[PDB]
Structures are given as C-alpha cells and as structure tokens.
Symmetry: C3
Subunit: 403 residues, 3 copies
C-alpha cells in the first residue's frame, strides 16, 4: 500500500510543479478536495454500507440499460438476438448494433430527466456541498457535479449565463470537470462492452472532487469570482437526435482510428524491421512508455506493460478506443489474465474524456457559450488535459488502494 500512497504523492507533486502559482493554492480547497475523493473511495470501495449503495446504483443503471435495449431490439431484430452467438460465435456480438444505440437511448433519457428538473435537483445538492466545503464558486461547482452524468460540453449548460464572465480559474476548472469525467451515454456504452459498472459509476462520482482538485492546484483562484423543449416528448426527441449524432461520430471514429492503428502497426513492423524488431507495434511502444506510469499508480511489475498499452492509448487517442482494446481482457477469452485489482485500476484510469482531441471539442462546445473566451480555452487547453489525466490516475490509485 506504500506504493499507492507514494503514487498519490507524485501525482499531487506534478500538479504543484505545473501550477500557475503554487503560493496561491488554497490549502482548504485542495486539501478537502483530495479528502473527499479519498473518502468517497474509502466509502464505496471499502466500507460495507458504501459498497451496498454502489452495487445498488449500478444495478439500477444496469436495468435502465436493458430497458433501452428494447428499442434497439425492435430496430435490428435478430441481429441483436441470441441466435447471433450460435451462428457466428464471438463475432455474433455486433458492436454497431449492441453498443452504439445505447448512446441514443441514454441521451434521450437524460434529456427527459432535465425537463423534469430531476437532474438539476441532484446537481444542486452535489454542487452545493462542494462549494460549501472547498470554497469554490457556485458556477464551477455545479458544472463539476453536473459532469458526473453528462459530457464536457453539456455540463456547463447548467451555468451558461455565468461562463462568459467567470474567472480564468473558474473557466479552467470547468474545462477540467469535463476532461476528468465522462457522460452517462458512453458510460452505459462501456458497460455494454464488459466494463464493470461499479467502477464506471464510482469513477464518475470521484471526478467531481478530483476534477476540482487538480484544477485548483494547477490553476488556483487569483481573481474575484461573481455570485427548453415545449414538452417532455420533445425533450426525448431532442435528446435522441443528439445521441444519434454522437453515435454516428463515435462509430466513424472507431472505424477510422482502429483502421489507422492497424495501418500504423503495419508500418511499424517494416520500420522496426530495419532495427531488428519486426514485431514492433503501437501497443509495444505505448506499453513500454506508460509502464512506469502504470507501475506508479499501483499496477504490479509484471502487469505494468500491458496496462500501459491501454492507458497510453486512452491518452494519445481517446478512452473509447482504449476501452475497445481493453474489453477483450475482461472476458474468458482474454489473451492475458489480469488481476482483479489491475482490472479496476485500468477501468478507473481510462474513465475520462482527457485527451488532446478534447481541446478542439472544448473550443467547439464550451467555446460557443463564450466566443470571446476561446482564446483562453486554447491557451489553458494543454494544462487542462494534464489536469484531467491526473484526476483519472488519482482515482485509479485510490481504487487500487482500497482493493
């Protein structure tokens, strides 16, 4: 457990070194933020009552997923039935029909829960508890709590009239809240790929204090902060349309990226052959390079390289592509049998939208909420991705600690 605590120290250390003003770091804020994330981890991953609450929220999500599967079962019929496994076997699981439509249903549901005020009610509680404990501003705290369920570009919408005039520290924290977390739609998508829901739900909740933690470490507050569809069926329709667009984007990206990686590996096998390494692939490079990082967060020495392949791929590309390559390692047909703790660490370290491509996404979604602040987003973009990555790594170290 000493390797984990040192891992937490190193991650905190990098944040301080990369700070904009280490002397401006509020010790109440970053102290409690780490305290909450650690206590939350101790709660739902260690203590009996906390584990019972986590398995109860996950089973509820797992039921919602199955209910939404009635929709895709209607559209694609027997292509998503059980006979697909008899005829095709492992290839019977058609990713395009099994996972992608889940993004559509969950986007429509969340859109409904927003219209009913259910989402706002939960966000107001989680967000209000953070600002009264960390001293963070109202707007950045709501966006942090919102990011537990929705994406990086949808979370600030709950405080969109406060975005164009919020401080650079607030705006940075807003960027970090979305980079450290995921969305409810893709969450259910990853769960359909074999990723344990308990880990996804946990990592999503720990993202709110964790996102604020490294946001106020690398960018402390130095300024002075301040302070709809016609019906429920329209809300569902709008959410379904937004999910469809997302589902198409994710699908095209996976076809391209995986294909590109396959092209890269083919070239790496030829270039590597010139130096006596014809078996050279992208996984080997990412694995060999992220193995120390994986070893630092609590992954065993003999599993650090394989774990480095997935964590590295999540960074250089995105977490969806990483999960796509990590999903086979969660079944009985896995090429490498990993320990249950390592499976948890990778699941937590991948659960985040933290990647270089998300900077252009933050410029698009969050940038449209404050067009005169696009210059500040592009400037703090790199620092925000790093801050988001550290939050995922910390959540993985905490998870590995209590497991």
């Amino acid at each position: 457990l000493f390797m984990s605590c040192c891992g937490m120290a190193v991650l905190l250390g990098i944040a301080v070194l990369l700070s904009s003003n280490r002397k401006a770091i509020n010790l109440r804020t970053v102290g409690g933020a780490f305290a909450i994330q650690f206590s939350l981890g101790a709660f739902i991953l260690y203590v009996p009552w906390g584990q019972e609450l986590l398995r109860g929220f996950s089973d509820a999500v797992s039921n919602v997923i199955n209910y939404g599967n009635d929709g895709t079962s209607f559209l694609f019929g027997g292509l998503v039935s059980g006979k697909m496994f008899e005829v095709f076997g492992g290839g019977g699981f058609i990713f395009a029909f099994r996972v992608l439509p889940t993004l559509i249903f969950f986007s429509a549901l969340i859109s409904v829960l927003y219209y009913l005020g259910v989402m706002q009610w939960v966000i107001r509680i989680l967000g209000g508890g953070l600002q009264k404990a960390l001293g963070t501003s109202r707007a950045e705290s709501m966006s942090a709590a919102a990011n537990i369920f929705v994406g990086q570009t949808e979370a600030p919408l709950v405080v969109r009239p406060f975005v164009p005039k919020m401080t650079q520290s607030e705006l940075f924290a807003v960027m970090c809240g979305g980079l450290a977390s995921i969305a409810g739609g893709v969450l259910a998508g990853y769960a359909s790929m074999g990723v344990k829901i308990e880990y996804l739900v946990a990592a999503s909740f720990m993202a709110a204090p964790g996102g604020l933690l490294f946001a106020k470490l690398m960018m402390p507050e130095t300024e002075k902060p301040q302070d709809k569809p016609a019906n429920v069926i329209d809300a569902a329709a709008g959410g379904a349309s937004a999910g469809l667009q997302l589902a198409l984007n994710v699908g095209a990206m996976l076809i391209a990226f995986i294909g590109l990686i396959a092209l890269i590996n083919g070239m790496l096998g030829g270039i590597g052959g010139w130096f006596g390494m014809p078996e050279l692939k992208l996984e080997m490079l990412l694995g060999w390079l992220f193995a120390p990082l994986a070893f630092l967060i609590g992954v065993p020495w003999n599993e650090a390289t394989v774990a480095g392949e997935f964590i590295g791929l999540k960074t250089v590309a995105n977490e969806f592509v990483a999960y796509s390559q990590f999903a086979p390692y969660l079944t009985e047909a896995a090429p490498v049998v990993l320990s249950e703790k390592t499976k948890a660490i990778i699941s937590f370290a991948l659960c985040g939208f933290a990647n270089l491509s998300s900077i252009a996404i933050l410029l698009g979604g969050l940038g449209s909420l404050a067009p005169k602040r696009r210059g500040d987003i592009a400037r703090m973009g790199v620092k925000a991705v790093i801050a988001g990555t550290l939050s995922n790594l910390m959540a993985a170290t905490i998870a590995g600690f209590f497991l």
Copy 2:
C-alpha cells in the same frame, strides 16, 4: 350503425364547442367538407367501382415499394433476403433494413415527381375542386390536397409565397392539413410493417376534406384572404438526402421512445405495486383511458381497451410508435385476434401526424416559411393538434360505418 352516426355527431360537437366563433362557421364549407369525406368513404369503401379504384391505386403503390426494395437489397444484401427468416425466424425481419430505407426511396421519387410537374398537376386538380365546393381560399386548398402525398412541412411549399400574409384561419387550416395526414414516405413504411395499403391510401385522401372540415369548425374565416434542382437527377439526389435524414431521425426516435416506454413500464410496475397493481403498464393506462374514445368511433366493447392502447400511444407519442406496437396485431402471431372492422378503425385513427411533438415541428418547418408568424403557430398549436386528431377519428368512424 347508430353508434357510428352518434360518433360522428360527438366529434362534430367537440369541434363546435372548441370553436373560436361558432357563429362564424360557414355552413357551406363545413357541410360540404363532411359531405365529401363521407361520400369519399362511401365511394372507396362501399360501392363496387370505388373499391376497384382503391385496390388499383394500392397495388400500384405496392409495386413501387417493391421496385424501391431493389435499392436496399443491393446495400444490405442477404440481411434483407429470405434466408433471414430461416436462420432467425420472426427476428429475421430487420426493421432498420426493411422499413427505414423505404423512406429514402419514396422521398427521392416524390422529389422527382415534383420536378416533372406531375405532383403539381394532381394537387392543382384536387385543390381546385375543394375551393370551388367549400369556398376555402386557393392557398389553403392546395396545401390540403398536397398533404395527401407529402408531409406537414413540405405541403405548404406549393404555396409558400402566400403563407406569410395568409389569414389566421388559413394558417390554422394549413397546420391542420398536415396534422390530419401523413406523408408518402412513411405511408410505404407502415405498409411494409403489415398495415393494409388500402386503408393508408384511403385515410390519406380523406385527410384533405377532413383536415379542412375541423379547421373551419374550430377556426372559421373571419378575415379576408387574398388571391428547384438543376435537373431530374439532382431532384432525386436531394430527395434521397432528405429521406436519409428522416430515416435516421425516425430510427433514433424509435430506439429511444420504445426504450423509454420499456423504462416507464418498469417503473409503473414498481409504483403500481404499492397499490396492489404490479402488472401496471403504459398500455393498460392508455387502453383504459382511450377505451371510451375507441368505443365511440365504432370499436366493439370487448375490443375498445386494446384499441385504446394504440390510439392513445399515437397521441401521447406519435403514429409511428403506435404502428410499431399495432403491427404485430396484424399477423398470425398476434396476442389478440381483432375483428377486421376494428383493424380498419385503428388503421384510420392512427393514420396521422397529429401529436404534441408536431407543434415544435410546425414551428420549425412551417415557421421557416413565415418567421413573423411563429407566434401564431405556437398559439394555435394545441387547437390544431386537436383538430387533426378529430379528422383521424372521423375517418375511422366513417370507415367503420361502411365496413
């Protein structure tokens, strides 16, 4: 037959009660409009020659559908072949590949028929006959006749330079013409789901006088009314693109709505359990609530509840979702064997875009044709949906009368 005639009376009665000026109702207009819709029903559903003309137009449509299926058979190959039924059985029918591509072909065809002037030629005849018999204005009569073949947002395009300056009664009638009818694309889609084409074609034609009927009952005229692609291949391309966008929208909606209903039923089973009704579902509620309405339009007492499930679902959601749940009741594997008359009544009462979500659609499509008239559309939106619903119910009562 006395229950049907009383049904017609009640439907007419509600329209008068909900009128904007019952004293301004032109008895020539609403008298002939009901006369035409009833005579049209008597024509193609009773008399020998009229039935021969209806079965001839439906077989032509059925052939066009099969011709368009050569396109989807090319793209999806064996996934839409006969071997799918051998391997999967009932689940062999893949809705996404069987029904959705039909929207693309029929949208491209109608776009072609517009370029050739074939559509305008038929509309000018049907629309001109209505205005000379009902006294309705030129523009609202053309949009009424256009709505037989095209959707609510495409029909007013034949009279789009007259929309921004037409009276509130004209604009309301335009809204009602599209709410009371469907489109040629989705028509072929419903036909591919097992819905009898003869009913769909009939209901589509009866929508023109029926739409004007309840438009001039709930909103009589109190003011004084007034009065392109480069080639045919481009027209087909533009229509195909519009159909594709529609096909994606419908598909995502069905995945979401059906999934949401599945989620609602799961919750209704838990909430209902608190009051000793664990088998409580959405179908039971909609059925129990729309049973008197179904019984009023001519559905037998022992079939009013089941029929109420579909009619209610068409209202609270849309007719596509309703048809999706009603389609299994048209096959030999139906959970409840319905009478041939009841099957007709449901088919006519569902054949319409009349739902609450269509108000936002009218604001989008029709609203773009008259941006300064969006306030009037949103105001008369609710009344227009009711007026559109009554037209479908009347067409169902007339159909049930002559059957």
Copy 3:
C-alpha cells in the same frame, strides 16, 4: 489498333469543335498534355518497369484497404466475416458494411497525410512538372495533380486563395480536373467491389494530364493568369467525420437510384409493350445508344452494346451506380463473359466524377471558395462535364491500345 488511334482522333476532334477559340489553343500545352497521358499509358501499361511500379503502388493501396478493414470488422463483427458467405452465399457480401466504411477510413487517412505535409509534397512535384511542361498556371496545375487522390471539391483547397481571382480558363480547368478524376476514398470503395486497382490507380494518374488536355482544348487561356486541425488526431477525426457524411450520402443515393431505375424499368416494360417491346429496360436504351461510343474507344462489336450500358449509366447518373452494375461482370458469376481488354476499357471510361449532377456539386464545394464566381461555374458547367467525359474516354482508348 487503327480503331483506337481513330478513336483518339475523334475525341480530340470533338474538343476542338466545342472550343471557345480553336485559334487560341496553345499547341505546346495540348500537344504535351496528350503526349504525357499517352506516354503515361505506354509506361504503366506496356513497358516492363512501368508495370512493376503500377503493381507495386496498387498492392500498397490494397494493404491499406485491408488495414482499414480492421475498423469495420470491429464495428460490424461477424456481419463482415467469412461465415456470412456460408450462411447466405452471394448475398453474404453486405455492401453497406463492406464498401461504405472504406470511405470513412480513407477520408481520415488522407486528412492525416495532409496534416503531415505528405500530400502537399507529392502534389507540389506532380503539379510543378505539369506547369513546366505544358505552360499551364501554378494554381490550376496543383489542383490537377491534387485531383489524383482527392475529390473535385477538395482538390482546389490547395490553391483556394487563388480561386476567386483566377481566369475563366483556370477555373474551367479546375472544374475539369475534378470531373475527369475520382477520389482516394471511392477508389478503395470500387476496388472492394471487384474493380482492378491497377486500372483505378492508372486512370487516376492519367486524369491530371487528361483533365488539363481537354480543358485547354475546349477553353484555351485568353486572359493573363496571376502568380488546419490542432493536431494529427484532430485531422483524423475531421477526416472520419467527412467520410461518414459521404458514406451516408452515397448509401442513400444508391438505395434511391437503383430503386428508381427498378421503377423506370417497370414502366419501360409497360410503355414498351405498347410498341411490341415488353422486355424494354433502361440498360437496353443506354446500351443501344452508347454502343457506337463504346465501339469507338476500342470495344469489340459484339461487346459494344453491353459496354454501352455501363458507360451510359455512368453519364446519366454517376460512376458509383455504374460500377455497382458492372461489378457482377467482374466475377465468375457474370451474366456475360467479357474480354480482359473490354473489362479494362469500361474500368477506365467509368473512373470519373463526370456527370450532370456534379455541376450542382461544383456549385456547392468549389462555389463556396468563390461566391462571386458561381455564375461562371454554372455557365461552363455543361462544357466541363463534356470535357471530363472525354478525358475518361481517352484514358480508356489509350488503355485499350496498349492492351
């Protein structure tokens, strides 16, 4: 071989007759342009070393195609596996999952190769060699060389600040470069349909001098010519999104057009029956009408009619629809066994975006680069399509000559 040389003469003759100023035709330009296209044909289709270089570039493309297929194999699983052929046979090949996703991968790859400067490097060499040999301007020469790999609306992007002010001859040549060629995305798509890659690669390269040839014949220069994503992963993402949109457009078009042709044939069988020709179809008309044209470019007398069906369909619709009907003639289950030379001629004569529908496309893509020049594009549109068609026919005659 005398029929081929006469074919080249006739094609050149039509260009001179349709010229804007036959007396303004630069004999250095059009002389060398035909010389290069003919020599290029003599190079990679006749001489040993040239054939070895063509088979080497095609095998590289064929490997890239297979690497990209790892992406679609992930998304669609067993629907693109080998068991599909066992269960369905010929219908096992699902076009929607086999060919369409290739457009997505190749669009993402080209987008990456642009970010790395690899594309610009090759274009600068091929484009620079043309302008120093033909005397053509810098901008139109780069767009000509760019068109070898990318589409008609993407090629002028390498010289987009020179488009609004370039002469009518330059703008026309730019239009012709894209009409005479295809794109790298659809190229790999056609290759997946059975079309020989060697022919597609060859025709793509011969399009650059061939496009300029008939551009400076039908529109000689009479005036005086003048003279980015944040990272590589964003470039791949943007290219994947553009490919997805293209893949959806192509798919919807094929469903519609093939379905429309099926509808046309059904009507032609009824109309033709009135004149004692009930077997009358669209293929017969296009075949009987384009048979002299096919016979002129080097197709045997007994194969000119069948070849006329495909060439005609490429013109009246597009090359994708033509390739879709020509692809079965490349397998062992072909209804008509064609000679290897005829298979090459059709492959070269179809390899082009030259169709009437591309005028509206040039108005959209190229028109957005110069909004005040849309009037000139629409004016020279028809002449440009003809000029693009002649370039494909010439490349087919040259190919048939050396084979």
